[PDB]
Curated annotation (Swiss-Prot), chain A:
Name assigned to this protein: Metal transporter CNNM3
Annotated compartments: Cell membrane
Signal peptide location: none
Family: Belongs to the ACDP family.
Species this chain originates from: Homo sapiens (Human)
Physiological role: Probable metal transporter.
Tissue distribution: Widely expressed. Expressed at higher level in heart and spleen.
Additional facts recorded: Shares weak sequence similarity with the cyclin family, hence its name. However, it has no cyclin-like function in vivo.
Amino acid sequence: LLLATQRFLSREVDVFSPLRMSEKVLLHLLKHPSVNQEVRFDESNRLATHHYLYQRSQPVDYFILILQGRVEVEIGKEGLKFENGAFTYYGVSALMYCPDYTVRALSDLQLIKVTRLQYLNALMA
Amino acid sequence: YKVTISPQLLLATQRFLSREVDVFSPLRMSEKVLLHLLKHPSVNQEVRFDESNRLATHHYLYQRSQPVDYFILILQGRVEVEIGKEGLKFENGAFTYYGVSALMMYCPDYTVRALSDLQLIKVTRLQYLNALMATRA
């Protein structure tokens, strides 16, 4: 549940290292409601605007971790394409600009979304 | 010791590449020539995963900024990829592929490391270009 996510972030994602963030602070953040977001997939318009979490032509505002669902990611100068799912994450740059990738929903998504402001606020702790 | 890959798996691999990867399009390489290439012993490779040394050098298929000149498709197994300017990390499995640009040294902006024993298709630039000439003759 939230334990898998906080464990994963603290272990794999530097900006959420326990050196920088109190585990209590991290979980309290995962709980705060604006961080738990959903993306409803309109299978009628697969390329609908709201399906795009990241675009190379749009500034990175937030870090995202996929809890549930699938996204298509084209990333890097080679623009390698992948189908990514739960516990893939994006926008660490937001918490440490436009990304070198595009990320599009392929299904309903449950997401953790953390803006630079929420992160910096959580550091003031 | 070198295991014979199932002929139907190599056929599935050929159909997949011909459909999904532009450098292997039938407009560039005939499906027959591609299948023949995928059957060559040097193209069928493995990574023996050393669980007592998970960062062993032979576990790395690609390394950021290190010149490379081969394409890889994973037939079986799991890899971790760290990619892009942010070095985002995620795990990939069977029938993911890498190094297309190495077939037009290219230096990738990703690192790819085995997380398990791997069974691989490995195509070098010279093997690819030789195959393009074979499609012509």
